[PDB]
Structures are given as structure tokens and as C-alpha cells.
Design a protein around this ligand. Sequence first.
Ligand SMILES: [Mg+2]
Ligand SMILES: [Mg+2]
Ligand SMILES: [Mg+2]
Ligand SMILES: [Mg+2]
Ligand SMILES: [Mg+2]
Ligand SMILES: [Mg+2]
Ligand SMILES: [Mg+2]
Ligand SMILES: [Mg+2]
Ligand SMILES: [Mg+2]
Ligand SMILES: [Mg+2]
Ligand SMILES: [Mg+2]
Ligand SMILES: [Mg+2]
Ligand SMILES: [Mg+2]
Ligand SMILES: [Mg+2]
Ligand SMILES: [Mg+2]
Ligand SMILES: [Mg+2]
Ligand SMILES: [Mg+2]
Ligand SMILES: [Mg+2]
Ligand SMILES: [Mg+2]
Ligand SMILES: [Mg+2]
Ligand SMILES: [Mg+2]
Ligand SMILES: [Mg+2]
Ligand SMILES: [Mg+2]
Ligand SMILES: [Mg+2]
Ligand SMILES: [Mg+2]
Ligand SMILES: [Mg+2]
Ligand SMILES: [Mg+2]
Ligand SMILES: [Mg+2]
Ligand SMILES: [Mg+2]
Ligand SMILES: [Mg+2]
Ligand SMILES: [Mg+2]
Ligand SMILES: [Mg+2]
Ligand SMILES: [Mg+2]
Ligand SMILES: [Mg+2]
Lengths: 141, 63, 70, 55, 56, 145, 63, 143, 206
Amino acid sequence: AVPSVQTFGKKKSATAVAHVKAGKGLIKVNGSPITLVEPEILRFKVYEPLLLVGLDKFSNIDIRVRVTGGGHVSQVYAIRQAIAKGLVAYHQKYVDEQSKNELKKAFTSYDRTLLIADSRRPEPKKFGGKGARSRFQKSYR
Amino acid sequence: GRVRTKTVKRASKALIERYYPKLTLDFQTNKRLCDEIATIQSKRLRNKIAGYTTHLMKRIQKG
Amino acid sequence: AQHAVILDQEKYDRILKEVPTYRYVSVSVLVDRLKIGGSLARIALRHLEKEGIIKPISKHSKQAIYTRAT
Amino acid sequence: TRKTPNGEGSKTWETYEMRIHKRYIDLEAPVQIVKRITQITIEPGVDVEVVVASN
Amino acid sequence: ALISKKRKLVADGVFYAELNEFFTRELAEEGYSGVEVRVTPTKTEVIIRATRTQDV
Amino acid sequence: SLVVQEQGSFQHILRLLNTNVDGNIKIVYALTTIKGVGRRYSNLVCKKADVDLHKRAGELTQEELERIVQIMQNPTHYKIPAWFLNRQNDITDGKDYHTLANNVESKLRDDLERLKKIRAHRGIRHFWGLRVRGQHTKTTGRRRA
Amino acid sequence: TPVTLAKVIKVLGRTGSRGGVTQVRVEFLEDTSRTIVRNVKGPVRENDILVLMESEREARRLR
Amino acid sequence: PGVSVRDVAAQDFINAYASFLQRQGKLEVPGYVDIVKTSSGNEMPPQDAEGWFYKRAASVARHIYMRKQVGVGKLNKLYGGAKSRGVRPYKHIDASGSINRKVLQALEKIGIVEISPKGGRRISENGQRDLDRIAAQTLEEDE
Amino acid sequence: FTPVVLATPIPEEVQQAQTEIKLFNKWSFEEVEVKDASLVDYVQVRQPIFVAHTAGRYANKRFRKAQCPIIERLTNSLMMNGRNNGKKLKAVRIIKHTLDIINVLTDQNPIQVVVDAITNTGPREDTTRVGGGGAARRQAVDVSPLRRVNQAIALLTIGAREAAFRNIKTIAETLAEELINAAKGSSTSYAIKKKDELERVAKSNR
RNA sequence: UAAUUGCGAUAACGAACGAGACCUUAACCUACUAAAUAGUGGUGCUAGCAUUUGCUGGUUAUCCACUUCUUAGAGGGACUAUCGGUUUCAAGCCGAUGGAAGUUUGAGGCAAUAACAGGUCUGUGAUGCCCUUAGACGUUCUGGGCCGCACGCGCGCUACACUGACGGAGCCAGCGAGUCUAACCUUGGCCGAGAGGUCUUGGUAAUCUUGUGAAACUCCGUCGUGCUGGGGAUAGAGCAUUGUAAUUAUUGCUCUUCAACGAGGAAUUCCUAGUAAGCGCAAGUCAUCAGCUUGCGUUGAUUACGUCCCUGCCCUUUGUACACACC
Ligand SMILES: [Mg+2]
Ligand SMILES: [Mg+2]
Ligand SMILES: [Mg+2]
Ligand SMILES: [Mg+2]
Ligand SMILES: [Mg+2]
Ligand SMILES: [Mg+2]
Ligand SMILES: [Mg+2]
Ligand SMILES: [Mg+2]
Ligand SMILES: [Mg+2]
Ligand SMILES: [Mg+2]
Ligand SMILES: [Mg+2]
Ligand SMILES: [Mg+2]
Ligand SMILES: [Mg+2]
Ligand SMILES: [Mg+2]
Ligand SMILES: [Mg+2]
Ligand SMILES: [Mg+2]
Ligand SMILES: [Mg+2]
Ligand SMILES: [Mg+2]
Ligand SMILES: [Mg+2]
Ligand SMILES: [Mg+2]
Ligand SMILES: [Mg+2]
Ligand SMILES: [Mg+2]
Ligand SMILES: [Mg+2]
Ligand SMILES: [Mg+2]
Ligand SMILES: [Mg+2]
Ligand SMILES: [Mg+2]
Ligand SMILES: [Mg+2]
Ligand SMILES: [Mg+2]
Ligand SMILES: [Mg+2]
Ligand SMILES: [Mg+2]
Ligand SMILES: [Mg+2]
Ligand SMILES: [Mg+2]
Ligand SMILES: [Mg+2]
Ligand SMILES: [Mg+2]
């Protein structure tokens, strides 16, 4: 076996799992390159980690991610979290601490919750309205 | 609002009354204390009590 | 029904000679030049690009954008 | 359900639920121990089923 | 036989609801207080908790 | 597609099936200002008449126009589904017609008449000027006639 | 035209019957050493910069 | 290098595979094209007219390449959209099983998909071959 | 910029811009400065972003609204009038086209021009409905910076929306149009007019 | 303070119900126990492309290993913590750092005393009294009616388009539910424009339907501001489905007909964050029928973070000839 870690990233209900082993430098999502992804407007949102931390860093590693659940935007945020959390998970086990804490440093700095799973969730609708807060309509008489 | 109920503050009162040696300005050890030293039915109630005996401790120290 | 649905030869040469000084050209800018509806105006955008004048600096549907040649 | 038997009042709704928990444990044994372990370990409320075979 | 696990468990509950009724009526002048039904191999067992088992 | 040219070859407005058709519109939609010819029937007919939907009603050879007329009023001959036709299974000779232009009015009348003349409740109700299709009339439709 | 720039220094409270106006003591930045009290329209905190349009005129209460 | 179709953006691939299936001249287009409407949840027939059957054949191809097996119904539910029930709310509705089934037969007869076990239609080895090929072709245009 | 590649390759200007400057869609975040004292601290610009889309929790505290990147505040306030609630991808792309268009006319960082229009439209003072006894006069009030930014955004988008409604120009052409005329106040823009009016009335009741 | 929540003042001291605690659900565990009904890495068997290793798939058992993702048992975790402002330096409140989480953590379950001539005898084989009881007000069968249409009022659905309709193409959820002495959820294969038909099939279910390939949405075109290709009422004709039965048209499909509505007077409802709004789905109901409801996830703002002006209500003080309590 080779050196490798696995991670995940989660926005709403999209969970994005990432395998980060040692290799020649692929960055594949589901089964296609990261240069597709589309959304497209949100393309750079998944490029973001690789450019925040220098593109080179991915030259001794292979990166695969697969996404289930969530919606279109939900998944794009779930994958970018899993790629960056993965990059720091491999430096945490294989390269040194000061490099891991420099990646966490340039991530957390700019950020967008690249390492930190956003905790927003849907609030339950309750009886009397079509939404959770939104009550229906009265007219009195 | 985070106004502690009477039971919290009353229990904190009796604890510091009779166990001031032991306890500290540290919640985490006061918490473990409240386990081995009182009989609280719930984790949450015990953390509230302990976190409050800790506040009274931290501010008894300056008067 | 208020005109701009064909080509009238003079309109062609009008288009050829009026598209400098257009920092902006798109479907709306062609229409606003008192001519071509949004059908044939898009053809004008595909064909003024056949060679010259318009530099495509924008992409797609609804929104088009071109600038003068250099 | 609607809380009311009739129809008057605000339209308060009330929701009931029953929780069904299912486990399965796979064991390889002879006949004796199976029959010993299933005639005992009886419990009112726990629904026990003991299947066999590979199909 | 052969009924889904959900329908089974509800059906078991209704079986208790109906048994608790019938006893609550049929054993009133004997202080009927409740039932429990234990399922076993061979038998299905019903235990009548009442305050007067000489009349039961 | 392509910048075109042409000369005085297209004349605006042109009258077919006793109605008038504006030029300068994309021909497929121009035949819809004729009665009994919607966007589907128009489409299929211009597809079947060997015409370029890209063209406007403006151009089109007189040959093309006449072929269009021919196909519209003879749909089953030029292989058109019959489930594509508004007046299937007539009600007397049982053939499949596609009633067109000033004729759809007549058949609405003829059909309505038939129900009234039979005294059938749909007739009665068309005679009273109400809603036939069974919809509640208490609340809806009040401006009306 | 004369623009006067004044830095919020203290928050005094809500005015207006409805309670959305806020009374504020401001120290204009071009030559300090002089305070005026103005009334705001939007949300305000300490150390903001209000564009007083007429430099000498203050108000107090609001109905 | 090496290549799959998973290496090509969806639209320039399918556009390419369409123009190829076009060029080809081998295909089989039942006949009721141009008169048909792809879904009872639709308003106008396709605007490609002389074509689109290639586009959906390419579309169906790439879809069956991407996974184990897919039947006529999965393609119906896939190619089904939102039907405006006029004045009533929208609803999801499935598209035509004739169009898709006749596509699966005109691509199986052209050996690019094959009745699979378990069920549905599986991508053909010869299809893998030719899809990966034109995929490579489509990237080659971007050089 | 020293190109680098690995297995799945990453494009030219993609690598180039990214690892170098941390700029927008592809526009400059350095330079561009708020040409007015105040409004700073309430117009973002730095830290820079790629595209105006963020899972930001700018709401669960009073003023944190002010630390949101300003362009995204513009984009956010695009996606309204019931039909376009949500639909931020729609808004984001409109903004991209809009910045491209503004850039076409009169050069300038189009993001800078945006900053210019936002500054130039916040009303320096307004009026409020005082009681004062039934017949209510109008008290002139000096409005906050934050309310000046907010009202600027809502003004420019809304007047751009009324102007794009029912005519051939697209939302991005009219948004750009409003951001162009309002960048340097020309009173041919819905925003400048309304700002000038709120100040005229506020002056006239002081 | 959300709270008779507390501090404090104190002829009161110390307490109990109720609030809080508690319970349920949504958040965090590369720590613990495990999983061919969940999934991952390796290995074979094998396809495709490049060939220099490589990339992308197939294979309910061909084996080995793991438990990050998924499942739910047991724990842990937050106590508004650390620091600093503010406050009688009190309870508390505010800001920053940290943190899965710092608005009662978010959302609910539960919930004292007392009141109402609120509603329900049309849920009950719960019931007093009255009425009726064979030319029945019992019950059943046939048919009609609850849908009837000058018009007033309330909940709603669809729209007036170009942040759009249409057409190709992209392609992503979560809460559910499903057949025994029966015909429920249904993949797949053919046939059919469709709606549907038909031959088989899996599933009493984390195993099959189902990854519920949902819809908004994304992309490339066509249309070009024209009641227009926005809008889809009204209506004619034809095909199907549930049912013993579809006429006053159960629903579904196809063609055609192509209304009002060009943003809505005075008025008035709901709402503060994954909320509002936009979007669809599942469940109830259901032989057939959702423009309804109950939940669910998808996309995801603007604006406050205040006040007592309007309204509604609680609290004291005060008057009382009321106490069946201003009906
Ligand atoms: Mg919801
Ligand atoms: Mg017509
Ligand atoms: Mg779909
Ligand atoms: Mg589609
Ligand atoms: Mg309360
Ligand atoms: Mg090698
Ligand atoms: Mg090799
Ligand atoms: Mg685990
Ligand atoms: Mg923080
Ligand atoms: Mg809780
Ligand atoms: Mg009464
Ligand atoms: Mg009752
Ligand atoms: Mg009675
Ligand atoms: Mg009942
Ligand atoms: Mg009872
Ligand atoms: Mg009776
Ligand atoms: Mg009724
Ligand atoms: Mg009424
Ligand atoms: Mg109601
Ligand atoms: Mg579309
Ligand atoms: Mg047929
Ligand atoms: Mg079977
Ligand atoms: Mg699922
Ligand atoms: Mg009009
Ligand atoms: Mg339409
Ligand atoms: Mg009937
Ligand atoms: Mg009737
Ligand atoms: Mg029309
Ligand atoms: Mg309106
Ligand atoms: Mg019915
Ligand atoms: Mg239903
Ligand atoms: Mg109902
Ligand atoms: Mg007196
Ligand atoms: Mg008194």
C-alpha cells in the first residue's frame, strides 16, 4: 500500500468524500476532472483551495472525490471542503506539522469554511403555515 | 436570556459553602468534582451547576 | 410589426459603416440603432464576426458583447 | 391528526409516532444449542425470528 | 400468516388495545387492573392483573 | 445563419384561405392567424410541404404557398396521423376531416345545433349560455356574457 | 458646497415615537474640540462618520 | 495520454457525437420524427427537425456508457420534465417510451449498446471503443 | 509565473491568474478605493474573492452585514421580485456580464465603478415622520453610513429593474447603465434622482 | 430575564406546583462496539483509451483487509467557556478569541390554578331527559341531490413575460409507503404519438420499486417587445384509464378554438437566517379524483436587532351600591 488518507465535506445534506493518496497528481471528482464540475460560475469555488495554497502541492498526491445527496450548490461547497480538509489531513499524517499548520493558516485566513462544516440545517415546518416561521393567512371577518 | 434558575444557584451556594478546599477557577475539574461529590440526575444540570460554582469561585477570590 | 424584420440592402451597408464608435454591440445595441429585430440582429452578430470589426469579449445567450477592431 | 373530534377552533395538529428497532445476529452452530438458546432468552415485546439456510 | 414488520407491530398493539378493553368490561366487579401478553413458542400467554383472582 | 439579400421578391401581407397573413413573421407562426391551424399543425405542415421554417412568411415562393394550402386541406393524403386532426370520425359519414378557416365556425355551429336539436342536456346548457363541462357556477365567471 | 464630517463618539438612545431614530454625540474630524448632537436614520455604532450637511444645528426630542 | 468520455465536457462531446452519427448515414430513425413530440409534457416538437434523434442517441449513448444498465423507463423519467397543467400547478411527467426505445434499438442494431443481464441496456465493448474515440477527437479539436 | 502541471491538467490563464494575484472573475481588487470618507468600513474590497457567492452568515449579528464583500451585496440584491427569489446563479452571472459591460465603457475597474455608484447615491440626510400632533411634520435626520450603503444598493438595483422591465435591453445592460451614470452622478439615473430628492425634501423641512 | 428568571431592597426566613430541569428531533466524535440488507481500499476475472507506469468502467461472494463516508448501541461534548468592556462592579447584558455548536444552541413534546353557558349528542354500544318506533325519524333497495346560478364575502391556483416562454442538452434531493390467506409499491422487454396496453420480474423490504436521474436551476440555440411564440379561460372533436355505473362532462392524452389579465382603489395577511420567498416530492384522503392539508429536502435574499405611534394583551394604582360579578 501507499500513504493515503480519506476525508469528507458537508453543506446542507450534500456529503462529499475524498481519497487522498500519494501519486502523480490527479484531481478527479466522481470520475471527471476538476476542470468540469459546472455549475461553472461556481467553478473557481472548487479551484479555490488549489490556488490558495499553491497549485504545486498536488504533485506528490492523487485526489479523488465523490458526492452524494444535496443539490447543485450544496455539492460544490461539500467537495471544496473535502479537498482542502483532505490536503491538510495528508500533511497531518505524512509531511510535518509546521506545513500542515501553514495550510490551515492560509485556508482559515481567507476561508469560506474550507475545514469547518457549516452547521445550518432546515428548520421544521410546523402546522398552521406553509413554512417554518411563515404562518398562513387570516381575514378576521 | 441566560439567567440561571434558583436550583443551580442554590446548589452552587451549598457546594462552595462546604467544599471550598477542592474546587478552583477551573470548570472542568469542578465538573468532575460535582460527579464524585453530588448526585445530579442530568449531565446538563450538572454542567450548569458546576459552571456556576466556578463563577462564584472565580469572583469570591477578589472579595 | 413596427419594422426591422428583413434586410433592405441599404440597411446592410448601414450596418457595415455604422459599427465603428460602437464600444458596445449586442442584440439590444443593434435594435436601439433603429433597425434589425432580435432575430436578424443575432445574425448580424454572427456575421460581423465572419471577419472583422467586432471582438468577442463575452460569451453566450441573452448577453452578448463585442468591441471595435484594433 | 387533528386534535379536535369536531372541527371548531384553531386547526391544531398533533403527530404521534411509534419506533420500530430491528437487529439481526448471524450465528453458526449445531441444532442443540440453537434450540436451547431460542426456547430460552424469551422476552415479551421482543419479536424473535430464527431463519436457516443460505437462500 | 406473513405480514410486514410494521403492520405486525401495529397489529400487535391493536390486539392489546382490544384485549385491554374486553377485560376492562368483563372483569369490572373483580378489580381488573391491566393485562400483559407474552408470546412464546407453543403458547400465547395472557396475564390478568386483578385485585380479586378468586372470582376470576 | 447568414445575412441574406433578396430584392423586391417578398411582398408584405398575403391572403390565403380567405384570411390575410402578415409577412415579416416566421411563416410557421403566420399560418396560425388562420383558423384551425395552431403551432403544431402549422409546424408539421411546413415540415411536410418541404419549406424552410427559418424563412419568414415574407419570402416563400408562390409554389410553396400553394403546396402549403394543398397539404392543410388534405392531411390524410400527405400522410398526417389523423390523431393529428381536430375533426376525427365526423359524426355522419365518419371520415377524418381537419376543418379550416371560415369553416371551423360552421362546424362549431353545426355541432352545437345538433345537441340543441336533440334536446340533449349539453344542448340545453349551450342554449342557456352557461358552462357545459360540469364546472361549479355559483362562484366563478360573473362578468360573463 | 460645504461637507462636514463628524465621528460618532457616544450613543445616547432611541428617539421618535416609533423608536428608530438614535441620538448621537459627534465630534467632527476637521478641527475637533467641539461636540454636536445629531439624529440618525439607520443603524449606528461607535466611531462611524456621519455627513452633517449643515454644520450648526442640533435637535433633541422626537414625537 | 489516454482518454475516456468522462474527460470531455458534456455538451461539446454530445454535439460532436451527434454530428458524427449525422455524418455516418447509418442510424435508423423510425420515421415518425418531425411529426412527434418527445413528451406529453411538452408543447412544441424539437427545433432541430432533421436531426435531434442523433442528439438523443448520443445523449442516450453517453448515459449508458456512464453506468451499469438503464432501461426505457429510466430514460423516460430522465428525459421527462415539467408539464404546465395550464392553470393548475406543475408536475413532473415522464417522456416518450417510443422515442427512447427506438433509440435503444437503433443503437443496439448499430452495436453501441446491448441488452444487458440484470436488465436494461449495457454499453457495448465496441461502443466503449468508439465513444472513447470521438471523445479523444473532441479534445483533439481543442489543441 | 512558473507553470506547473500534474496528471489532470489545469488551464493556462487559470493557473496564471490564480497563483499570482487573487483577483475577481478576472478584475483587480488592489487599487479601487472608496472616493469618500465614511463608507469605508462599510464598503468591502479586500479580502478579494473569485466570484460573488458565499455561504456567509452575515445575518446572525447586527453589523456583520458590513463585512460582506460589496459586489456580492450587489448580486444578492439583484435576486428579488418574487420570481427571482433565490436564483443566485442567475444573479452572479448577470453581475459578471455587467462588470464586463461597464468595463467596455470608459475603461476603469468596473468593480471600482460599482464602488463609485454606491458612494454617489447614499443620501447624506433624509426625513422621518414625527408626530408633533396629528398633522405630522418631517424631521430632517442625518442617516447612518450603513443605511447609506444599503439604500444605495436597493436604489440602483430597483431602478435598474424597473428599467429592464418590458424592454429589449437585458438586466445586465441596464444595471450597467445605472452603475455607469450613477458612478459620476448624471441625474439620468433612477438612483441619483431619488438621492437628490430625499436630500431636497430633507433640506426643505429643517 | 423568554419567565414570581434572578440580583437586590427588605418583618420576613426557608420552601413546593407551574417556568427551568426533563423528554424528542437536528447539529459535533479518523475515540468505543460492529455490519453481503451500509460502504471503502487490495486482489484476482474482465472492457475501453493510451501505452512508460497510467486513466475510466464491469464482475450481491473469487478471496483479504478496513469502518472515513452510511447504520444505531454505549459514551463524550457547552457550563453562554477564555479575555475584555458595561452595569448598583450584583443578577445580567455587550464585543473579541476559541469552538460542531454560544438568539432558551436551532425546532418541537410536555405543561399548574382558574375561567367560557367557546365547539362537539353528526366519532363512540359515552350518556340524562324529550321526541319517534311499522303509512318508521328503524334499516335496505332504485333514482336524484349536496356541484344547482342575477349576485355579496374568505382561503387559494395560474398569470400579465425578455432575472422570460419555447426547444434541445446539462443533471442534483430529503421526509415517506408498499401484496395473505391477496392483487399493494412495481424495475425490465416488446407495441403504441400520447395517454396506455402487454409478457415477464424483484420486494412483507436499509435487500426490490429507488440513486425515488423531483422541480426550480445550469448550458446552446429559436423567438424579439408586438395582448407576442406572455397567458391559458371558454369550447368542439377523437383516443384511453378507475369503476357495476362517468350524462350534469372522475382523471388522463391529441388536435383545434386563443377570453380576462399591460402590476391591481380603499383596504389588509405573513414574516428576522438556511428564515422569507421561489421549487418540487412524499404521506393523509384515495376504486378513480389535489388547485387542500401534514411533513420533507432543493435554490436561497433584502431589512431591524429597535420602539410604544397604531392595535392586542398582562401588571399595579384607583372607584364601586357589582359578587349570578357590566351579558
Ligand atoms: Mg421547507
Ligand atoms: Mg390557429
Ligand atoms: Mg430532470
Ligand atoms: Mg431537459
Ligand atoms: Mg412565559
Ligand atoms: Mg512501467
Ligand atoms: Mg502497466
Ligand atoms: Mg463511523
Ligand atoms: Mg468565530
Ligand atoms: Mg436539546
Ligand atoms: Mg352557546
Ligand atoms: Mg361527542
Ligand atoms: Mg340520543
Ligand atoms: Mg368518526
Ligand atoms: Mg369513550
Ligand atoms: Mg331519525
Ligand atoms: Mg359541500
Ligand atoms: Mg364570508
Ligand atoms: Mg383556514
Ligand atoms: Mg428550459
Ligand atoms: Mg397508433
Ligand atoms: Mg412474488
Ligand atoms: Mg436517498
Ligand atoms: Mg398586450
Ligand atoms: Mg404558452
Ligand atoms: Mg357524469
Ligand atoms: Mg347537479
Ligand atoms: Mg397568443
Ligand atoms: Mg405586484
Ligand atoms: Mg369524487
Ligand atoms: Mg396524494
Ligand atoms: Mg380537506
Ligand atoms: Mg367613594
Ligand atoms: Mg376595593
